[PDB]
């Protein structure tokens, strides 16, 4: 985990973090581990008009997965979420998520949260 974004999570308000928690919740709705698996991450991408491969998703996961386990939990998700907020989408000092997929934070908030995504 790039702590620059963890400090952007430090920058995230409890409200901000909560908003991604609420996303985390839906992100892993029906999840066994309760943390974002690739199938889990792909769920919202599907909800987002995509059809990402768990391979593409796995690297996305890994990006913010601190243990390389293959599942993104809240603070990892907060970094993954916050990562997109550092700039428009952020370029370098960051993994590129291959090139095929990438979480559009705000747009993805739409796919899960439904209404709750409105506030920021």
From Swiss-Prot:
Organism lineage? Eukaryota, Metazoa, Chordata, Craniata, Vertebrata
> What name is this protein filed under?
Troponin C, slow skeletal and cardiac muscles
Q: Which residues carry this modification: N-acetylmethionine?
A: 1
Q: Which family does the similarity line name?
A: Belongs to the troponin C family.
EF-hand domain residues are: 16-51, 52-87
* Record-listed Ca(2+) 1 binding positions: 65, 67, 69, 71, 76
- Any single Gene Ontology cellular-component annotation: troponin complex
Q: Which part of the complete sequence is present?
A: 1 to 92 of 161
User: What's the miscellaneous note?
Assistant: Cardiac muscle Tn-C can bind 3 calcium ions per molecule. Domain I does not bind calcium.
Known role: Troponin is the central regulatory protein of striated muscle contraction. Tn consists of three components: Tn-I which is the inhibitor of actomyosin ATPase, Tn-T which contains the binding site for tropomyosin and Tn-C. The binding of calcium to Tn-C abolishes the inhibitory action of Tn on actin filaments.
Task: Provide any one GO MF term from the record.
Answer: protein homodimerization activity
Disease in which the protein is involved = Cardiomyopathy, dilated, 1Z: A disorder characterized by ventricular dilation and impaired systolic function, resulting in congestive heart failure and arrhythmia. Patients are at risk of premature death.
Q: Report the record's Gene Ontology biological process terms.
A: cardiac muscle contraction; diaphragm contraction; muscle filament sliding; regulation of ATP-dependent activity; regulation of muscle contraction; regulation of muscle filament sliding speed; response to metal ion; skeletal muscle contraction
Keywords for this protein: Acetylation, Calcium, Cardiomyopathy, Disease variant, Metal-binding, Muscle protein, Phosphoprotein, Repeat
């Amino acid at each position: 985990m790039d702590d620059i974004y963890k400090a952007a999570v430090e920058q995230l308000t409890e409200e901000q973090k909560n908003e991604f928690k609420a996303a985390f919740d839906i992100f892993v709705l029906g999840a066994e581990d309760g943390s974002i698996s690739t199938k889990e991450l792909g769920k919202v991408m599907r909800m987002l008009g995509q059809n990402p491969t768990p391979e593409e998703l796995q690297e996305m996961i890994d990006e913010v997965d601190e243990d390389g386990s293959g599942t993104v939990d809240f603070d990892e998700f907060l970094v993954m979420m916050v990562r997109s907020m550092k700039d428009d989408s952020k370029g370098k000092f960051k993994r590129p998520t291959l090139r095929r997929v990438r979480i559009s934070a705000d747009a993805m908030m739409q796919a899960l949260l439904g209404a709750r995504a409105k506030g920021h």
